[PDB]
Design a protein around this nucleic acid. Structure first.
Ligand SMILES: [Zn+2]
Ligand SMILES: [Zn+2]
Ligand SMILES: [Zn+2]
Ligand SMILES: [Zn+2]
Ligand SMILES: [Zn+2]
Lengths: 71, 98, 74, 102, 84, 101, 107, 93, 40, 95, 82, 107, 93
DNA sequence: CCGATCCCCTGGAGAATCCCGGTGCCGAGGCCGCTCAATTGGTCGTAGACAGCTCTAGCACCGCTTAAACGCACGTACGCGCTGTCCCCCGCGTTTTAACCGCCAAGGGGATTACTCCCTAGTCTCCAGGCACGTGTCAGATATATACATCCTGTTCCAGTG
DNA sequence: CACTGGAACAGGATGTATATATCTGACACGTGCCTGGAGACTAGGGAGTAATCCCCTTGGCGGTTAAAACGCGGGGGACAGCGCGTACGTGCGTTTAAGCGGTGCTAGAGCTGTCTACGACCAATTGAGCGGCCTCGGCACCGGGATTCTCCAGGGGATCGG
């Protein structure tokens, strides 16, 4: 499936006091099974898309860094 | 909850004490046995005056202290506070002993 | 009148003061002209440290005199 | 491509016996300071009483000549192939000696 | 002989190396510094002892003297004071 | 250390020399691995033997290999500093000349 | 006539005669002059006086009255020119000059 | 047997400089070694200069040049001054 | 009596052998000390 | 046009394969004379002496640059900066 | 008076020396640092050479004097005699 | 009797007589033994032969028939023991060994 | 005025080792300097040893000890072998 | 307009370190005898300081050619924060082990003395080994043409998403 | 079916190694000669050898701790990934001065003769400095206050959500 619902699952997995960090979501995707090595640009553009659409907002960092949390 | 000092304080205190002191730090008997170990290779049934092993210990301690100072400078230059074998190797290579 | 102050970095500064001016005014002026905190400044002339509340006349400072400025971090 | 040669072992014998025992090289060991080869037992027995080479009297080492001896596997294989049945004979002696003291 | 002295290079204890580093001005020490220091000290001692033994053997004696050790250190460029 | 004689090695008996007048028949490949130069892949000539690993090479072969770089043994990768780490082998030279004149 | 030492002639404390004898038997040259030992003794005396003055100042800084290798090392390593002259020499029981890298200190 | 040293002379200099300070045995050995080292360095330099210039004599000029080569800066300057003063006093006396 | 430090000209007492202000070691009769602690 | 680095590597190879001097003779001579002017007035210099001075200076500079390159590389960079030279000299014992 | 003779040591020359040393990337202050280092080195060597020639009662500095100075400083140089 | 050179007597090429004279006139000691010059001449000859052989090998590799300072520098620097012996010596017109730090190599 | 050098001896050694190879003037001067430097080092060490043991003679034993002190490892071993063989050959004639 | 969450301030319990006064012990400093080397006084040989002369190599200046240095425009890749994870030294308490100190006993070899002999410095005569100088020839630097290896960018194909 | 990117490939420009012709200046060899090395021979002192003394090194034994070793909990520093923007490499067109070849001059390096003062060598002598002995005061070690330096809990303070 396209990475959208996997990203939703990753962000919904913890939903802790702060947002999930970029390294944490990469680790979760790798554990679930995915080639995050060659999809750095794909995950970056997905992050851009789901911060543009307002589904998930960025907590503290800028660009692809920092933490993310659901709306 | 007992008393605990945060990391670094005891290190600084020991640094001050050992820089203010002047006594030897390595133990006489182990150093003597190591000296006899090394000397055993060249000749057999040698004997050592006590002043000889004292001088050897003095020279070894001075050399190690200087090497550690240069190692600390290298580690600081590398933007760290922990000394490492890479720092020791770089210091010795630049000094010209290897 | 005009007097001089010599620093430890080889820099010489000039000040416009009067015999009736106090040491507090002088350190206020060096604050104004170079930004150095008055607390870290020690003034020297005739081998003697200047006091905070005294005047320049009390030390018999004349025109074109040169003080010595020392900085110690607090 | 060379041919197959039939030659005197008597003509070749000179460069194959250990001078300490007089017999063919068995588990050869060589001192490296003059590159001199003998039997391992022969040379180790010699080195316990003297510090010079049996042939040219060159000092093997200042204190511990046991540090300057190396096994010559190539020489041992060459002498094994030159001498017929030597390896089988030695294997038989080993089994015979081991069959009595276990 | 008296004994085949062996495994004595570890005489320098980890605490001793730490004390030397503290005197040198070191705050944080890794785990491999101990092995590296032991190797360096062994090399230094080997060189100096070889020089001193050469002097003593040339002197036709059987006791290594502080004078010979001082001379070896001077030969290596490590002049030392306090022992004649 | 690593040289203490075993129980058999304490009293092993010498092997008698064969004085019988018989001939040895050898193919040109019987001693190939023992008489082939590791560098030029041919027979030895002016054999040079390393002091540390007792490995045999041609003089020119080993000198060129060392001069080019990588001052280690071409066979067992053990380092050798210069020419002084090798020695000539008159025994090997005589044996080679006898076997294949 | 009464004998007067060359050290008394030159107003020096060091043994000019001993320096001359050492120069002669030191195998340095075929022959030696007259003023060379006096000059060498004066230089040695000046160096010794400077070193002893610095060492005495360092010793009295610690409210003690005996010069020790610690005070000698302190003075030698604190004097720039003396340290440059004695850069490659080790002093027994001399210790190390106390200093701390600023980055290592808390701030 | 006799073993010569510089102990008494260094003690005299110490009494000229600091009239109330004493010296320990180890410090005495340190100072003796220092004097010996400086002496041998200067003598070696003077001998090398004389050999280079095809001369057979060590003189005050050679000692002066050796001191200038060895001692750094102000130390060399003051050493040269002291040596010249001592030599001229010895000659004029 | 008192002596004057070369670094800062302060009239320092005889009993002290470190300068009160700039904390530089006193020099010898002939050679006076030079610039030390270049940073202010 | 080439990307950055190619010409650098080519120049490294070229200048490591050659042995000629890299500093202009007349400027080096003028520098030597000016430096020596402070010690004695109206001096003269031999051409061999000037060449020896230049050879020694170039060798010393090349060695110092190799050391500073090692220091900079240890600092996890590929660009040399003055602190690298300062640290190299500090460890060597020239400062 | 001779002035601004250190500026004769040019940035391309320093670049060539660094290239021979194996340097790929150079900052902007390396040139000034190198000029200072070279000036100090030359000052020391020239002082020793001038002392030698002054002692020799001559007025021309020679390659032998330069070689002796380098030997004294620990930088022995071969090829120019001695 | 016909004169026979000491160098030929010892089977050497170097001037044993010149070495003996230099040992006399160098102010090394009061007396110099008869066997001393032979040893020194032999050692010097051995070292010269070694360095010349290495230089000749390098020159033959470079397809030239004359030894140059570049060949001498290559021979000295490519041998560990000779490099240690001459570590503090600068050879004029020698250049440096071709060596590039690996990480500077573009991957 | 004659100025002596080791040119002829170095050339003879070069012809002994490599029959068909020549040498240039700069390399000749380099070899001359190398020989002089090694000679001075060994002689200085031997003289120091002779003074050190309270003796006034430099002999083959002192030269051997100096060579072993200076040359590293295999170079020292081969130099010692050459010196001993040369001395034996010279004295047995 | 209050929860609660992070950020700056102060007080007090607790551990380290300086300052003062006591006590004991050993080595620093001063004195006595002697002996060997530094002084004084003379003679003799040559090392070098001074003056003269010769010629060579260093300094100063000119004009031409062309290779190198300078200044500028432009793009890109590398240094320098910034964040986040995790793992590995640090501080401390409990067990264990061997270094230090004091004491004894044996004897090995370092240090000293007397004797002697042969090895090297010193001197003279004789001669050939090596050095300065001159000259011919080919090793090698330079110029020119050519083939092969590197490097770079534009295009193309196959795999993602919307 | 219509967008994107990332890996793969090919031709053009560039640089470098390879193959010949040249002409020339430095290397290698031959010659005369003179100074330094070799051969004989004598004398005296340094070093080798043998005997003896006793200073110091090695080896062993027992207690007493002080240091070393091991394990535990946790916080802070090392390391990896990411983005940005500025300094640095590259190429071009213009300006500068270094290198070459030649001339002219002369200050000074280098060699030679002389002659005088300075340093080595030798005897007689006497006083400074080294060895031995001893004794008393500065310094090491002890214990008790007093003082300074860390570290954590409690507490105000600004701020988002509700
Ligand atoms: Zn056998
Ligand atoms: Zn053998
Ligand atoms: Zn081969
Ligand atoms: Zn091998
Ligand atoms: Zn001051």
């Amino acid at each position: 499936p396209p990475v959208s619902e996997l990203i939703t699952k990753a962000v919904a997995a913890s939903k802790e006091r702060s947002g999930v960090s970029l390294a944490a979501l990469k680790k979760a995707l790798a554990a679930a099974g995915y080639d995050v090595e060659k999809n750095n640009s794909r995950i970056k553009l997905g992050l851009k898309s789901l911060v543009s659409k307002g589904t998930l907002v960025q907590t503290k960092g800028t660009g692809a860094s920092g933490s993310f949390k659901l709306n | 909850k007992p008393h605990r000092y945060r990391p670094g304080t005891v290190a600084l205190r020991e640094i001050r004490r050992y820089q203010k002191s002047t006594e030897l730090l390595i133990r006489k008997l182990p150093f003597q046995r190591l000296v006899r170990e090394i000397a055993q290779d060249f000749k057999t049934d040698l004997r050592f005056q006590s002043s000889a092993v004292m001088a050897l210990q003095e020279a070894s301690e001075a050399y190690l202290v200087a090497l550690f100072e240069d190692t600390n400078l290298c580690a600081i230059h590398a933007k760290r506070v922990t000394i490492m074998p890479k720092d020791i190797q770089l210091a010795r290579r630049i000094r010209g002993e290897r | 009148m005009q007097i001089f102050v010599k620093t430890l970095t080889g820099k010489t500064i000039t000040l416009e003061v009067e015999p009736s001016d106090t040491i507090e005014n002088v350190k206020a002026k060096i604050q104004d002209k170079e930004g150095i905190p008055p607390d870290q400044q020690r003034l020297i002339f005739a081998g003697k440290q200047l006091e905070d509340g005294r005047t320049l006349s009390d030390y018999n400072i004349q025109k074109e005199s040169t003080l010595h400025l020392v900085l110690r971090l607090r | 491509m060379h041919r197959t040669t039939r030659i005197k072992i008597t003509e070749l014998n000179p460069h194959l016996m250990c001078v300490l025992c007089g017999g063919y090289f068995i588990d050869a060991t060589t001192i490296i300071e003059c590159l001199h080869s003998f039997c391992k037992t022969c040379i180790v027995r010699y080195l316990e009483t003297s510090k010079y080479c049996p042939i040219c009297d060159v000092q093997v080492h200042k204190t511990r000549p046991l540090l300057n001896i190396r096994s010559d596997k190539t020489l041992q294989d060459i002498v094994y192939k030159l001498v017929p049945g030597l390896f089988k004979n030695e294997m038989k002696r080993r089994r015979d000696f081991y069959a009595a003291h276990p | 002989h008296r004994k085949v002295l062996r495994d004595n290079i570890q005489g320098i204890t980890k605490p001793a190396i730490r004390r030397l580093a503290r005197r040198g001005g070191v705050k944080r020490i890794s785990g491999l510094i101990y092995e590296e220091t032991r190797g360096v000290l062994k090399v230094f001692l080997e060189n100096v002892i070889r020089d001193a033994v050469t002097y003593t053997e040339h002197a036709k004696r059987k006791t290594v003297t502080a004078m010979d050790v001082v001379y070896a250190l001077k030969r290596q460029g490590r002049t030392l004071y306090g022992f004649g | 250390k690593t040289w203490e004689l075993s129980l058999y090695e304490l009293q092993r008996t010498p092997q008698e020399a064969i004085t019988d007048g018989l001939e040895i028949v050898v193919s040109p490949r019987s001693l190939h691995s023992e008489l082939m130069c590791p560098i030029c892949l041919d027979m030895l000539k002016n054999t040079m033997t390393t002091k540390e690993c007792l490995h045999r090479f041609c003089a020119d072969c080993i000198i060129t290999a060392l001069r080019s770089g990588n001052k280690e043994c071409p066979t067992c990768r053990k380092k050798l500093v210069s020419k002084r780490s090798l020695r000539p082998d008159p025994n090997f030279d005589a044996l080679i000349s006898k076997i294949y004149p | 006539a009464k004998a007067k030492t060359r050290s008394s002639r030159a107003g020096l404390q060091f043994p000019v005669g001993r320096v001359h004898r050492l120069l002669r038997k030191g195998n340095y040259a075929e022959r030696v002059g007259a003023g060379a030992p006096v000059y060498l003794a004066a230089v040695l005396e000046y160096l010794t006086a400077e070193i002893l003055e610095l060492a005495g100042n360092a010793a009295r800084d610690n409210k003690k009255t005996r010069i020790i290798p610690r005070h000698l090392q302190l003075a030698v390593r604190n004097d720039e020119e003396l340290n440059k002259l004695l850069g490659r020499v080790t002093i027994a029981q001399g210790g190390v000059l106390p200093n701390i890298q600023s980055v290592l200190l808390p701030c | 047997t006799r073993k010569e040293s510089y102990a008494i002379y260094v003690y005299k200099v110490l009494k000229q400089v600091h009239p109330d300070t004493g010296i320990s045995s180890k410090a005495m050995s340190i100072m003796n070694s220092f004097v010996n080292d400086v002496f041998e360095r200067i003598a070696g330099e003077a001998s090398r200069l004389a050999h280079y210039n095809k001369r057979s004599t060590i003189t005050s000029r050679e000692i002066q040049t050796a001191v200038r080569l060895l001692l750094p800066g102000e130390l060399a300057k003051h050493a040269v001054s002291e040596g010249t003063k001592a030599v001229t006093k010895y000659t004029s006396a | 009596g008192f002596w004057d430090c070369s670094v800062c000209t302060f009239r320092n007492s005889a009993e002290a052998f470190k300068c009160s202000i700039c904390d530089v070691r006193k020099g010898t009769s002939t050679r006076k000390p030079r610039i030390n602690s270049q940073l202010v």
